[PDB]
Amino acid sequence: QVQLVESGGGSLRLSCAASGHTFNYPIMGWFRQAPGKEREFVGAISWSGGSTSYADSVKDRFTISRDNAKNTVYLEMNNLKPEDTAVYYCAAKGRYSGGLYYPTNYDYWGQGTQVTV
Amino acid sequence: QVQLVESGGGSLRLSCAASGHTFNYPIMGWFRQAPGKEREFVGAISWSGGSTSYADSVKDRFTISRDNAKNTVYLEMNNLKPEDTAVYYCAAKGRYSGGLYYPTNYDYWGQGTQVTV
Amino acid sequence: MSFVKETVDKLLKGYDIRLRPDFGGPPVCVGMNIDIASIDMVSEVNMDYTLTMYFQQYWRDKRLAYSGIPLNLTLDNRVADQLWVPDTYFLNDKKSFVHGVTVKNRMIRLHPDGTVLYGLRITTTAACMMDLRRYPLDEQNCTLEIESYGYTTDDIEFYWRGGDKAVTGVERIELPQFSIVEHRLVSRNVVFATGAYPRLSLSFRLKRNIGYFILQTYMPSILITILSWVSFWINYDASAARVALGITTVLTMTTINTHLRETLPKIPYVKAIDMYLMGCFVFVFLALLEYAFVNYIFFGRDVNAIDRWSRIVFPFTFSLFNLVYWLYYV
Amino acid sequence: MSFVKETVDKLLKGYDIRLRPDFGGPPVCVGMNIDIASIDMVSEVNMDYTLTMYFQQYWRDKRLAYSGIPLNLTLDNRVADQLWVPDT
Ligand SMILES: *[C@@H]1O[C@H](CO)[C@@H](O[C@@H]2O[C@H](CO)[C@@H](O[C@@H]3O[C@H](CO[C@H]4O[C@H](CO[C@H]5O[C@H](CO)[C@@H](O)[C@H](O)[C@@H]5O)[C@@H](O)[C@H](O[C@H]5O[C@H](CO)[C@@H](O)[C@H](O)[C@@H]5O)[C@@H]4O)[C@@H](O)[C@H](O[C@H]4O[C@H](CO)[C@@H](O)[C@H](O)[C@@H]4O)[C@@H]3O)[C@H](O)[C@H]2NC(C)=O)[C@H](O)[C@H]1NC(C)=O
Ligand SMILES: *[C@@H]1O[C@H](CO)[C@@H](O[C@@H]2O[C@H](CO)[C@@H](O[C@@H]3O[C@H](CO)[C@@H](O)[C@H](O)[C@@H]3O)[C@H](O)[C@H]2NC(C)=O)[C@H](O)[C@H]1NC(C)=O
Ligand SMILES: *[C@@H]1O[C@H](CO)[C@@H](O[C@@H]2O[C@H](CO)[C@@H](O)[C@H](O)[C@H]2NC(C)=O)[C@H](O)[C@H]1NC(C)=O
Ligand SMILES: CCCCCCCCCC
Ligand SMILES: CCCCCC
Ligand SMILES: CCCCCC
């Protein structure tokens, strides 16, 4: 298993720290859930740190980095809009789970932080 | 990307110097465009030297060579005839681009040097 | 059930398989979509990479159009052979196949509007020529080239379905010695004597991991050279000690170089690691020659000036060599 | 389209694959040309090299001659199954 903990929450940097069998769940994805709306896929990052994938809405605004030396994923935000107010979640995905944009494929979730702007 | 610059416009030596990602664009070809006439292939040189190809019109008269000391390709134009007057260009061609004799297959073109004699 | 059967048989009937859709009309338009599964071992010896993917071709055929039967049919193995499909092929592949177990990993789905979707599961070994001149500090560019074999641009056009989202699954790749920095999708019309053929290129940029080489190549050579410098501080009359030290450092350098080129890929031309190793070898050889000069001049034929000069010049020269090497190759 | 298919099927009729073009006549001229793609490997141990190429052959067969369709019939791989080819 893996235990994920999100922290943080206009230069905002969220941090999702993972502990446990992190190798078995390499891909890590950030989601956001505004009030009323369902979870939406914000971004995804691989194991080696390359080949990041962002959503169409926030492709250039946000940037996701990684450093396996401490098992933490950083989600930076440069310019924030008032539709971005939401609860930001972090999740882990298996190596043969499936697509990135669907929260069901992700196994272990985090409690999720809150951001308002 | 790659940038090509011509210089050196009896025996006339024309040196085309390439700067940039030369490996991704191994083959270099020479083209001539006389005023009012279409661009025409004359010769081509591969990456590792040798394997020179020439057009029928300039066979046994022009001999292309490369030393790659400073990534330079030398046309070494000899037996100059009055019909051999045109704007000479050097162009780069990828590993998988197609035939040598077609300008469309060449990615990057140099500024071009004028010879009138 | 029987209604679907007889309708599919009727769809087969009157169908010419040697003729593409709209033979005299405008060219067919085929959208490609790749879902990468993994990039297996990448060989410097063979200059190729093995890639597994789900390859999908999407096009429209008015001949295979039916009204009624709202569900989209799915031909599997037998009647699928009785439909026209594009003659797409990978230009630079060296060996490839469609997976067979348990059944042929192929799928054909026809929508009621005449649209055809053709999916395959393909493993393919593709040629990737590498510039191993800055090895192991090199950055490589591999490509997969997709092209029609017999039809020119006037008969078939290719494109990336979904634009830049056509290729997916890049993040799934977990090569051990390489990291994918970027990937690109390109569409061109390569011109042959026959005419302009379509072409698609899926390019990856790979950056090698360097800590392995820092651990097992650069550090031992530096330590051996530093050990070789100990002769200058050892007393000059300790002939057996200094000679044994120098010659054994030379032996260790040769051992390192030989076993290193044995364990590494063949790569039968010059690299950067070879220049670094040869520089270290020349340094230890020069140290032994320096002791030879000392022994001949003094004690043969208040520390001596030759060793006093060696102690300051050898580390300084080695530092300049490292500076030049790292600046040139980084 | 339908005319093209009918002409192709008419060409397919009246064709014995076992017989070369001009069986009783002089030899058939089979032009050839190659387009090299790469030489992958050159082994001194095995004394061989690997060569990838496009092999193009040109010949003539009056049995498959047609008319009334002024264009190049660029058929599919399948078409070959019915036509005689050189035993190169
Ligand atoms: C080697 O490494 C691999 C690396 O992945 C590792 O794999 C994981 O192994 C663990 C077990 O150790 C797997 O966890 C189990 O998964 C079960 C299936 O989960 C899916 O389906 C859930 C719904 O039930 C399914 O099955 C029923 C019939 O049984 C069927 O009717 C349903 O339709 C359905 O098919 C589903 O809930 C689950 O999660 C999704 O949905 C929930 C909804 O709440 C959501 O919270 C999740 O985020 C997610 O979207 C998933 O889709 C699962 O049933 C099982 O559950 C155990 O615990 C629950 C309580 O937590 C108990 O109720 C239940 O009885 C079980 O005890 C458990 O979670 C995990 O899926 C593997 N991961 C992958 C990617 O395969 C191996 O274990 C390693 N092994 C070794 C030897 O080293
Ligand atoms: C046969 O299969 C095709 C798909 O291969 C079906 O059509 C496709 O259906 C999907 C799902 O509805 C369409 O995708 C999206 O649907 C949502 C619905 O809310 C819409 O919001 C999106 O904009 C999008 O349209 C897809 O567009 C559609 N088109 C294609 C490619 O065929 C088809 O319905 C199936 N037929 C039956 C009845 O089985
Ligand atoms: C069918 O193919 C033939 C053979 O390539 C084409 O004819 C040749 O066309 C080229 C290009 O113009 C010329 O350089 C050759 O001299 C032609 N030779 C012969 C024998 O025809 C022909 O044009 C093609 N058909 C169509 C409709 O283009
Ligand atoms: C090159 C390693 C040899 C170090 C000798 C240092 C001697 C210090 C004397 C004070
Ligand atoms: C090949 C490098 C030689 C360095 C001499 C000090
Ligand atoms: C890269 C470190 C070199 C040190 C030489 C004294």
Side-chain angles (χ1 to χ4, degrees), chain B residues 1 22-24 47 95-99 102 104-107, chain C residues 91-92 127 129-131 133 141 188 190-193 199:
Chain B
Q1 294 82 17
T22 50
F23 194 87
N24 285 343
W47 168 259
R95 206 162 275 98
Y96 316 99
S97 279
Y102 311 94
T104 311
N105 288 3
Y106 289 75
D107 287 314
Chain C
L91 188 87
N92 57 1
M129 272 293 296
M130 310 196 146
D131 178 33
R133 271 200 275 89
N141 183 317
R188 302 183 70 256
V190 300
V191 174
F192 283 93
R199 179 166 298 186

PDB file of all heavy atoms in Angstrom, chain B residues 1 22-24 47 95-99 102 104-107, chain C residues 91-92 127 129-131 133 141 188 190-193 199:
ATOM      1  N   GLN B   1      17.594  22.163 -34.233  1.00  0.00           N
ATOM      2  CA  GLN B   1      17.690  22.973 -35.480  1.00  0.00           C
ATOM      3  C   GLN B   1      19.137  23.042 -35.954  1.00  0.00           C
ATOM      4  O   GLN B   1      20.050  22.611 -35.249  1.00  0.00           O
ATOM      5  CB  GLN B   1      17.143  24.384 -35.254  1.00  0.00           C
ATOM      6  CG  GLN B   1      15.642  24.440 -34.978  1.00  0.00           C
ATOM      7  CD  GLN B   1      15.282  24.141 -33.532  1.00  0.00           C
ATOM      8  OE1 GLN B   1      16.129  24.194 -32.639  1.00  0.00           O
ATOM      9  NE2 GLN B   1      14.014  23.824 -33.295  1.00  0.00           N
ATOM     10  N   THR B  22      23.496  18.734 -36.093  1.00  0.00           N
ATOM     11  CA  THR B  22      23.874  18.202 -37.396  1.00  0.00           C
ATOM     12  C   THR B  22      23.596  16.710 -37.514  1.00  0.00           C
ATOM     13  O   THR B  22      23.343  16.219 -38.620  1.00  0.00           O
ATOM     14  CB  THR B  22      25.356  18.471 -37.662  1.00  0.00           C
ATOM     15  OG1 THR B  22      26.133  18.044 -36.537  1.00  0.00           O
ATOM     16  CG2 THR B  22      25.596  19.954 -37.904  1.00  0.00           C
ATOM     17  N   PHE B  23      23.646  15.975 -36.400  1.00  0.00           N
ATOM     18  CA  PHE B  23      23.471  14.527 -36.461  1.00  0.00           C
ATOM     19  C   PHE B  23      22.066  14.153 -36.918  1.00  0.00           C
ATOM     20  O   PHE B  23      21.891  13.220 -37.710  1.00  0.00           O
ATOM     21  CB  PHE B  23      23.771  13.904 -35.101  1.00  0.00           C
ATOM     22  CG  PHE B  23      23.953  12.416 -35.148  1.00  0.00           C
ATOM     23  CD1 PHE B  23      25.196  11.867 -35.413  1.00  0.00           C
ATOM     24  CD2 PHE B  23      22.884  11.565 -34.927  1.00  0.00           C
ATOM     25  CE1 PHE B  23      25.369  10.499 -35.456  1.00  0.00           C
ATOM     26  CE2 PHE B  23      23.052  10.196 -34.970  1.00  0.00           C
ATOM     27  CZ  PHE B  23      24.295   9.662 -35.235  1.00  0.00           C
ATOM     28  N   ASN B  24      21.050  14.866 -36.427  1.00  0.00           N
ATOM     29  CA  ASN B  24      19.677  14.579 -36.828  1.00  0.00           C
ATOM     30  C   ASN B  24      19.429  14.861 -38.305  1.00  0.00           C
ATOM     31  O   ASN B  24      18.439  14.367 -38.854  1.00  0.00           O
ATOM     32  CB  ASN B  24      18.698  15.397 -35.982  1.00  0.00           C
ATOM     33  CG  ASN B  24      18.546  14.856 -34.572  1.00  0.00           C
ATOM     34  OD1 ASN B  24      18.910  13.716 -34.284  1.00  0.00           O
ATOM     35  ND2 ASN B  24      18.001  15.677 -33.683  1.00  0.00           N
ATOM     36  N   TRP B  47      26.881  11.400 -44.184  1.00  0.00           N
ATOM     37  CA  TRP B  47      27.359  11.844 -42.877  1.00  0.00           C
ATOM     38  C   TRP B  47      28.830  11.499 -42.673  1.00  0.00           C
ATOM     39  O   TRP B  47      29.639  12.361 -42.317  1.00  0.00           O
ATOM     40  CB  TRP B  47      26.508  11.218 -41.773  1.00  0.00           C
ATOM     41  CG  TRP B  47      27.091  11.376 -40.400  1.00  0.00           C
ATOM     42  CD1 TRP B  47      27.782  10.439 -39.688  1.00  0.00           C
ATOM     43  CD2 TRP B  47      27.032  12.545 -39.576  1.00  0.00           C
ATOM     44  NE1 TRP B  47      28.157  10.953 -38.470  1.00  0.00           N
ATOM     45  CE2 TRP B  47      27.710  12.245 -38.378  1.00  0.00           C
ATOM     46  CE3 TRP B  47      26.473  13.817 -39.734  1.00  0.00           C
ATOM     47  CZ2 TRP B  47      27.842  13.169 -37.344  1.00  0.00           C
ATOM     48  CZ3 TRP B  47      26.607  14.733 -38.708  1.00  0.00           C
ATOM     49  CH2 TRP B  47      27.285  14.406 -37.528  1.00  0.00           C
ATOM     50  N   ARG B  95      17.614  11.639 -41.919  1.00  0.00           N
ATOM     51  CA  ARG B  95      17.918  10.242 -42.196  1.00  0.00           C
ATOM     52  C   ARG B  95      16.795   9.569 -42.976  1.00  0.00           C
ATOM     53  O   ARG B  95      17.062   8.694 -43.806  1.00  0.00           O
ATOM     54  CB  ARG B  95      18.177   9.499 -40.886  1.00  0.00           C
ATOM     55  CG  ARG B  95      19.069   8.278 -41.028  1.00  0.00           C
ATOM     56  CD  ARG B  95      19.640   7.842 -39.687  1.00  0.00           C
ATOM     57  NE  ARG B  95      20.859   8.573 -39.350  1.00  0.00           N
ATOM     58  CZ  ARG B  95      20.938   9.635 -38.555  1.00  0.00           C
ATOM     59  NH1 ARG B  95      19.870  10.156 -37.968  1.00  0.00           N
ATOM     60  NH2 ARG B  95      22.125  10.194 -38.340  1.00  0.00           N
ATOM     61  N   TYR B  96      15.545   9.960 -42.721  1.00  0.00           N
ATOM     62  CA  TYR B  96      14.370   9.429 -43.415  1.00  0.00           C
ATOM     63  C   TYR B  96      13.602  10.623 -43.979  1.00  0.00           C
ATOM     64  O   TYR B  96      12.723  11.173 -43.309  1.00  0.00           O
ATOM     65  CB  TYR B  96      13.504   8.589 -42.473  1.00  0.00           C
ATOM     66  CG  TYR B  96      14.287   7.645 -41.590  1.00  0.00           C
ATOM     67  CD1 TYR B  96      14.577   7.977 -40.275  1.00  0.00           C
ATOM     68  CD2 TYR B  96      14.730   6.420 -42.068  1.00  0.00           C
ATOM     69  CE1 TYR B  96      15.290   7.119 -39.462  1.00  0.00           C
ATOM     70  CE2 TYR B  96      15.444   5.555 -41.262  1.00  0.00           C
ATOM     71  CZ  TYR B  96      15.721   5.910 -39.960  1.00  0.00           C
ATOM     72  OH  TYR B  96      16.432   5.054 -39.152  1.00  0.00           O
ATOM     73  N   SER B  97      13.943  11.023 -45.205  1.00  0.00           N
ATOM     74  CA  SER B  97      13.282  12.145 -45.867  1.00  0.00           C
ATOM     75  C   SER B  97      12.869  11.814 -47.298  1.00  0.00           C
ATOM     76  O   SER B  97      11.913  12.403 -47.812  1.00  0.00           O
ATOM     77  CB  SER B  97      14.196  13.372 -45.855  1.00  0.00           C
ATOM     78  OG  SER B  97      14.125  14.041 -44.608  1.00  0.00           O
ATOM     79  N   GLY B  98      13.575  10.884 -47.946  1.00  0.00           N
ATOM     80  CA  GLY B  98      13.245  10.441 -49.288  1.00  0.00           C
ATOM     81  C   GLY B  98      14.403  10.653 -50.251  1.00  0.00           C
ATOM     82  O   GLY B  98      15.575  10.493 -49.887  1.00  0.00           O
ATOM     83  N   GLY B  99      14.056  11.007 -51.488  1.00  0.00           N
ATOM     84  CA  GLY B  99      15.057  11.149 -52.523  1.00  0.00           C
ATOM     85  C   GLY B  99      15.907  12.394 -52.355  1.00  0.00           C
ATOM     86  O   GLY B  99      15.512  13.385 -51.740  1.00  0.00           O
ATOM     87  N   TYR B 102      15.069  16.179 -54.781  1.00  0.00           N
ATOM     88  CA  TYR B 102      13.825  16.929 -54.639  1.00  0.00           C
ATOM     89  C   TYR B 102      13.984  17.988 -53.553  1.00  0.00           C
ATOM     90  O   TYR B 102      14.259  17.619 -52.402  1.00  0.00           O
ATOM     91  CB  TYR B 102      12.685  15.972 -54.304  1.00  0.00           C
ATOM     92  CG  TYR B 102      12.660  14.785 -55.240  1.00  0.00           C
ATOM     93  CD1 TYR B 102      13.289  13.595 -54.902  1.00  0.00           C
ATOM     94  CD2 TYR B 102      12.024  14.862 -56.472  1.00  0.00           C
ATOM     95  CE1 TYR B 102      13.281  12.515 -55.757  1.00  0.00           C
ATOM     96  CE2 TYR B 102      12.011  13.784 -57.336  1.00  0.00           C
ATOM     97  CZ  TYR B 102      12.641  12.613 -56.972  1.00  0.00           C
ATOM     98  OH  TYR B 102      12.636  11.535 -57.823  1.00  0.00           O
ATOM     99  N   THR B 104      11.913  19.639 -51.807  1.00  0.00           N
ATOM    100  CA  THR B 104      10.928  19.603 -50.730  1.00  0.00           C
ATOM    101  C   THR B 104      11.379  18.719 -49.574  1.00  0.00           C
ATOM    102  O   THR B 104      10.996  18.960 -48.425  1.00  0.00           O
ATOM    103  CB  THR B 104       9.581  19.118 -51.270  1.00  0.00           C
ATOM    104  OG1 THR B 104       9.253  19.841 -52.463  1.00  0.00           O
ATOM    105  CG2 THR B 104       8.479  19.327 -50.238  1.00  0.00           C
ATOM    106  N   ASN B 105      12.188  17.697 -49.853  1.00  0.00           N
ATOM    107  CA  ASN B 105      12.647  16.783 -48.815  1.00  0.00           C
ATOM    108  C   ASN B 105      13.692  17.393 -47.889  1.00  0.00           C
ATOM    109  O   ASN B 105      14.015  16.778 -46.867  1.00  0.00           O
ATOM    110  CB  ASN B 105      13.222  15.517 -49.455  1.00  0.00           C
ATOM    111  CG  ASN B 105      12.150  14.627 -50.047  1.00  0.00           C
ATOM    112  OD1 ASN B 105      10.967  14.963 -50.031  1.00  0.00           O
ATOM    113  ND2 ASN B 105      12.561  13.481 -50.575  1.00  0.00           N
ATOM    114  N   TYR B 106      14.220  18.572 -48.208  1.00  0.00           N
ATOM    115  CA  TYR B 106      15.280  19.203 -47.432  1.00  0.00           C
ATOM    116  C   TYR B 106      14.668  20.189 -46.445  1.00  0.00           C
ATOM    117  O   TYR B 106      13.831  21.013 -46.822  1.00  0.00           O
ATOM    118  CB  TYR B 106      16.272  19.912 -48.351  1.00  0.00           C
ATOM    119  CG  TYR B 106      17.142  18.963 -49.147  1.00  0.00           C
ATOM    120  CD1 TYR B 106      16.631  18.266 -50.233  1.00  0.00           C
ATOM    121  CD2 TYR B 106      18.473  18.767 -48.814  1.00  0.00           C
ATOM    122  CE1 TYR B 106      17.419  17.398 -50.959  1.00  0.00           C
ATOM    123  CE2 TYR B 106      19.271  17.902 -49.536  1.00  0.00           C
ATOM    124  CZ  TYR B 106      18.738  17.220 -50.608  1.00  0.00           C
ATOM    125  OH  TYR B 106      19.527  16.355 -51.331  1.00  0.00           O
ATOM    126  N   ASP B 107      15.095  20.101 -45.184  1.00  0.00           N
ATOM    127  CA  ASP B 107      14.467  20.880 -44.122  1.00  0.00           C
ATOM    128  C   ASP B 107      14.965  22.322 -44.107  1.00  0.00           C
ATOM    129  O   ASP B 107      14.184  23.262 -44.293  1.00  0.00           O
ATOM    130  CB  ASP B 107      14.723  20.215 -42.767  1.00  0.00           C
ATOM    131  CG  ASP B 107      13.915  18.948 -42.576  1.00  0.00           C
ATOM    132  OD1 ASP B 107      12.702  18.962 -42.873  1.00  0.00           O
ATOM    133  OD2 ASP B 107      14.493  17.936 -42.128  1.00  0.00           O
TER     134      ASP B 107
ATOM    135  N   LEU C  91       8.478   2.519 -41.479  1.00  0.00           N
ATOM    136  CA  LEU C  91       9.595   2.612 -42.414  1.00  0.00           C
ATOM    137  C   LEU C  91      10.872   2.028 -41.822  1.00  0.00           C
ATOM    138  O   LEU C  91      11.599   1.295 -42.502  1.00  0.00           O
ATOM    139  CB  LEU C  91       9.812   4.072 -42.810  1.00  0.00           C
ATOM    140  CG  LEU C  91      10.820   4.363 -43.923  1.00  0.00           C
ATOM    141  CD1 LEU C  91      10.151   4.275 -45.277  1.00  0.00           C
ATOM    142  CD2 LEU C  91      11.445   5.729 -43.718  1.00  0.00           C
ATOM    143  N   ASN C  92      11.155   2.333 -40.558  1.00  0.00           N
ATOM    144  CA  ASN C  92      12.435   2.008 -39.941  1.00  0.00           C
ATOM    145  C   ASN C  92      12.382   0.763 -39.062  1.00  0.00           C
ATOM    146  O   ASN C  92      13.356   0.482 -38.357  1.00  0.00           O
ATOM    147  CB  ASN C  92      12.945   3.199 -39.123  1.00  0.00           C
ATOM    148  CG  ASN C  92      11.971   3.641 -38.049  1.00  0.00           C
ATOM    149  OD1 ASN C  92      10.899   3.059 -37.888  1.00  0.00           O
ATOM    150  ND2 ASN C  92      12.342   4.676 -37.307  1.00  0.00           N
ATOM    151  N   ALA C 127      14.824   1.060 -35.732  1.00  0.00           N
ATOM    152  CA  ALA C 127      16.196   1.539 -35.795  1.00  0.00           C
ATOM    153  C   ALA C 127      16.282   2.946 -35.223  1.00  0.00           C
ATOM    154  O   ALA C 127      15.464   3.810 -35.556  1.00  0.00           O
ATOM    155  CB  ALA C 127      16.703   1.523 -37.237  1.00  0.00           C
ATOM    156  N   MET C 129      19.548   5.326 -34.790  1.00  0.00           N
ATOM    157  CA  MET C 129      20.964   5.657 -34.838  1.00  0.00           C
ATOM    158  C   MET C 129      21.292   6.668 -33.748  1.00  0.00           C
ATOM    159  O   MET C 129      20.558   7.639 -33.540  1.00  0.00           O
ATOM    160  CB  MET C 129      21.335   6.216 -36.213  1.00  0.00           C
ATOM    161  CG  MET C 129      21.715   5.153 -37.241  1.00  0.00           C
ATOM    162  SD  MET C 129      23.248   4.269 -36.878  1.00  0.00           S
ATOM    163  CE  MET C 129      24.455   5.588 -36.987  1.00  0.00           C
ATOM    164  N   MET C 130      22.407   6.439 -33.056  1.00  0.00           N
ATOM    165  CA  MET C 130      22.774   7.188 -31.862  1.00  0.00           C
ATOM    166  C   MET C 130      24.114   7.879 -32.060  1.00  0.00           C
ATOM    167  O   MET C 130      25.023   7.327 -32.689  1.00  0.00           O
ATOM    168  CB  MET C 130      22.845   6.265 -30.643  1.00  0.00           C
ATOM    169  CG  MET C 130      21.622   5.384 -30.469  1.00  0.00           C
ATOM    170  SD  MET C 130      21.516   4.669 -28.819  1.00  0.00           S
ATOM    171  CE  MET C 130      19.742   4.623 -28.577  1.00  0.00           C
ATOM    172  N   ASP C 131      24.225   9.092 -31.516  1.00  0.00           N
ATOM    173  CA  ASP C 131      25.463   9.868 -31.548  1.00  0.00           C
ATOM    174  C   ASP C 131      26.211   9.614 -30.244  1.00  0.00           C
ATOM    175  O   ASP C 131      26.107  10.365 -29.274  1.00  0.00           O
ATOM    176  CB  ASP C 131      25.164  11.350 -31.745  1.00  0.00           C
ATOM    177  CG  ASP C 131      26.415  12.203 -31.728  1.00  0.00           C
ATOM    178  OD1 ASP C 131      27.476  11.715 -32.171  1.00  0.00           O
ATOM    179  OD2 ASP C 131      26.340  13.362 -31.269  1.00  0.00           O
ATOM    180  N   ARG C 133      29.166  10.090 -29.208  1.00  0.00           N
ATOM    181  CA  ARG C 133      30.398  10.866 -29.141  1.00  0.00           C
ATOM    182  C   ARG C 133      30.600  11.528 -27.789  1.00  0.00           C
ATOM    183  O   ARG C 133      31.746  11.749 -27.385  1.00  0.00           O
ATOM    184  CB  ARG C 133      30.404  11.946 -30.231  1.00  0.00           C
ATOM    185  CG  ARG C 133      30.992  11.491 -31.568  1.00  0.00           C
ATOM    186  CD  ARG C 133      31.432  12.661 -32.443  1.00  0.00           C
ATOM    187  NE  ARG C 133      30.328  13.211 -33.226  1.00  0.00           N
ATOM    188  CZ  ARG C 133      29.507  14.177 -32.829  1.00  0.00           C
ATOM    189  NH1 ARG C 133      29.608  14.734 -31.630  1.00  0.00           N
ATOM    190  NH2 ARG C 133      28.554  14.596 -33.657  1.00  0.00           N
ATOM    191  N   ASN C 141      17.849  10.996 -29.819  1.00  0.00           N
ATOM    192  CA  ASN C 141      16.567  11.292 -30.458  1.00  0.00           C
ATOM    193  C   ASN C 141      16.182  10.048 -31.251  1.00  0.00           C
ATOM    194  O   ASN C 141      16.782   9.768 -32.293  1.00  0.00           O
ATOM    195  CB  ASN C 141      16.668  12.535 -31.350  1.00  0.00           C
ATOM    196  CG  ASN C 141      15.336  12.932 -31.980  1.00  0.00           C
ATOM    197  OD1 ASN C 141      14.576  12.094 -32.465  1.00  0.00           O
ATOM    198  ND2 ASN C 141      15.058  14.228 -31.988  1.00  0.00           N
ATOM    199  N   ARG C 188       4.245  14.969 -42.499  1.00  0.00           N
ATOM    200  CA  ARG C 188       4.969  15.472 -43.661  1.00  0.00           C
ATOM    201  C   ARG C 188       4.528  14.716 -44.910  1.00  0.00           C
ATOM    202  O   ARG C 188       3.792  13.725 -44.843  1.00  0.00           O
ATOM    203  CB  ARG C 188       6.484  15.334 -43.470  1.00  0.00           C
ATOM    204  CG  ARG C 188       7.023  16.057 -42.257  1.00  0.00           C
ATOM    205  CD  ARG C 188       8.534  15.957 -42.165  1.00  0.00           C
ATOM    206  NE  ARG C 188       9.198  16.734 -43.210  1.00  0.00           N
ATOM    207  CZ  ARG C 188       9.774  16.243 -44.303  1.00  0.00           C
ATOM    208  NH1 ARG C 188       9.764  14.948 -44.585  1.00  0.00           N
ATOM    209  NH2 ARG C 188      10.373  17.079 -45.147  1.00  0.00           N
ATOM    210  N   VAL C 190       6.762  13.199 -47.768  1.00  0.00           N
ATOM    211  CA  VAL C 190       8.046  12.890 -48.387  1.00  0.00           C
ATOM    212  C   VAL C 190       7.844  12.679 -49.882  1.00  0.00           C
ATOM    213  O   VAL C 190       6.923  11.969 -50.306  1.00  0.00           O
ATOM    214  CB  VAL C 190       8.691  11.661 -47.729  1.00  0.00           C
ATOM    215  CG1 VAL C 190       8.933  11.922 -46.253  1.00  0.00           C
ATOM    216  CG2 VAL C 190       7.847  10.395 -47.936  1.00  0.00           C
ATOM    217  N   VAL C 191       8.711  13.292 -50.685  1.00  0.00           N
ATOM    218  CA  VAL C 191       8.589  13.288 -52.140  1.00  0.00           C
ATOM    219  C   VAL C 191       9.571  12.274 -52.710  1.00  0.00           C
ATOM    220  O   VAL C 191      10.789  12.416 -52.548  1.00  0.00           O
ATOM    221  CB  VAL C 191       8.840  14.687 -52.725  1.00  0.00           C
ATOM    222  CG1 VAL C 191       8.865  14.630 -54.248  1.00  0.00           C
ATOM    223  CG2 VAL C 191       7.776  15.663 -52.239  1.00  0.00           C
ATOM    224  N   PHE C 192       9.036  11.253 -53.374  1.00  0.00           N
ATOM    225  CA  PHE C 192       9.801  10.273 -54.130  1.00  0.00           C
ATOM    226  C   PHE C 192       9.613  10.541 -55.621  1.00  0.00           C
ATOM    227  O   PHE C 192       8.907  11.469 -56.025  1.00  0.00           O
ATOM    228  CB  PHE C 192       9.367   8.852 -53.752  1.00  0.00           C
ATOM    229  CG  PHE C 192       9.910   8.381 -52.433  1.00  0.00           C
ATOM    230  CD1 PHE C 192       9.178   8.539 -51.271  1.00  0.00           C
ATOM    231  CD2 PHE C 192      11.151   7.772 -52.361  1.00  0.00           C
ATOM    232  CE1 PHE C 192       9.676   8.103 -50.058  1.00  0.00           C
ATOM    233  CE2 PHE C 192      11.653   7.334 -51.151  1.00  0.00           C
ATOM    234  CZ  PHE C 192      10.915   7.499 -49.999  1.00  0.00           C
ATOM    235  N   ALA C 193      10.263   9.717 -56.447  1.00  0.00           N
ATOM    236  CA  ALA C 193      10.101   9.844 -57.891  1.00  0.00           C
ATOM    237  C   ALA C 193       8.658   9.595 -58.307  1.00  0.00           C
ATOM    238  O   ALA C 193       8.130  10.284 -59.188  1.00  0.00           O
ATOM    239  CB  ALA C 193      11.042   8.878 -58.611  1.00  0.00           C
ATOM    240  N   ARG C 199       3.601  10.837 -44.503  1.00  0.00           N
ATOM    241  CA  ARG C 199       4.465  10.326 -43.452  1.00  0.00           C
ATOM    242  C   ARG C 199       4.112  10.967 -42.121  1.00  0.00           C
ATOM    243  O   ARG C 199       3.811  12.161 -42.054  1.00  0.00           O
ATOM    244  CB  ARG C 199       5.945  10.570 -43.763  1.00  0.00           C
ATOM    245  CG  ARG C 199       6.877  10.063 -42.663  1.00  0.00           C
ATOM    246  CD  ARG C 199       8.325   9.990 -43.100  1.00  0.00           C
ATOM    247  NE  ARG C 199       8.526   9.054 -44.200  1.00  0.00           N
ATOM    248  CZ  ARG C 199       9.708   8.714 -44.698  1.00  0.00           C
ATOM    249  NH1 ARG C 199      10.834   9.226 -44.227  1.00  0.00           N
ATOM    250  NH2 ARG C 199       9.764   7.837 -45.695  1.00  0.00           N
TER     251      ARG C 199
END
